[PDB]
């Protein structure tokens, strides 16, 4: 019985990380096994030229950096695949959405160009889009050092989520992340306790094919 | 007056390389400003990573390694057009059509999904296919310990490369490699005196769109 494979995508400083680890935490607790993921994946060899050019400590051209985001998903696939096929659950913070959505955002990128990289990857099950004002988001810290941490460019960015969400193929659920903590968390928690159910009963799917 | 772009790709030991130099060496020699670039350039860190890949040093998940390819195709774009800008010819030692032709030639790898990371890149004006019977490059030295150094791979790269011969929008010379280094050399360098004249009137164009 596979495992599902859900993932948290969303507006900045939306939760994405909190809800990722209470959702593992919650289903691991009801006796399911689930494990967490996250793009990037900073650790390996591109993760770390990844981090280094969020950090602002390197440049990296717009193609290349893209591509780069791309291959730091495809190089975790064989653990994917393997993991969902042995009843493992996993709950990825950021996917391909987010690699096509921050790349979209910048002056003369397609979003069709920026999708083809990642066509074929592992399908989610569940696509989570955790909602939140630009501006509500601002009362949740302030804007940092890393890059893309700006409103116009997340603006641009959540334009570009808004197009990969008209996306019929994809399960697609809208998260009201206004709320506290715990009442998003309890709204997450059954949306993905339906899916890891239900949207397991078929097999694993390609993504953009 | 700006630089052509000219690209050798070729059959294995077709002498990519060894006409790349000669070419470069002889349109100096006959004033013209050219230099020579190569791809895989393993002189970067995504370079270093490829380059390890094709020594077996390191294994890299297939669709990862297609993409880390083209990243680094892409990193030198800039350069490229900076180069081209400034009428000086750049003589390229494989490009896109080697990335496409080499990920292609494994299962489950569409020639449309191996092109999409390159659509884009700068067009050359010129490109070279080295023909020789993957036989009389037997005759040049034997497989080595590199990655993809099979005949039977090999076999499947060149059905690539011919498929990719099709695209009317590039400009495709056949050389016969067969023959001397000299005579190949002259053969190459009219072809490459010709584009640079004639090809060059027109803007730099992206390659595949
Ligand atoms: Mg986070
Ligand atoms: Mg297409
Ligand atoms: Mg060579």
Redesign the interface.
């Known amino acids: 019985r596979r495992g599902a494979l859900i993932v948290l995508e969303g507006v900045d400083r939306a939760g994405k990380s909190t809800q990722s680890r209470k959702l593992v935490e919650a289903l691991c607790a009801a006796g399911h096994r689930a494990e967490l993921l996250r793009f990037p994946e900073r650790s390996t060899?591109?993760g770390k030229?990844l981090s280094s050019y969020l950090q602002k400590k390197s440049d990296?051209?717009d193609?290349?950096?893209h591509?780069?985001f791309?291959?730091?998903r495809?190089?975790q696939?064989?653990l994917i695949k393997e993991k969902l096929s042995q009843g493992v659950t996993l709950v990825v913070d950021r996917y391909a959405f987010s690699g096509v959505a921050f790349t979209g955002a910048k002056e003369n990128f397609s979003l069709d160009?920026c999708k083809?990289?990642d066509?074929?990857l592992p399908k989610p099950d569940l696509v989570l889009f955790l909602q939140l004002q630009l501006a509500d988001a601002a009362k949740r810290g302030a804007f940092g050092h890393e890059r893309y941490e700006n409103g116009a460019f997340q603006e641009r960015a959540l334009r570009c989520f808004h197009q990969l969400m008209k996306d019929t193929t994809l399960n697609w659920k809208m998260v009201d992340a206004s709320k506290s903590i715990e009442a998003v968390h309890e709204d997450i928690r059954v949306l993905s306790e339906d899916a890891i159910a239900t949207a397991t009963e078929k097999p694993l799917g390609e993504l953009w094919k």
């Open positions: 060899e591109i030229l990296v051209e193609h290349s950096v591509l780069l791309s291959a730091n495809w190089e696939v064989p160009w083809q990289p066509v074929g």
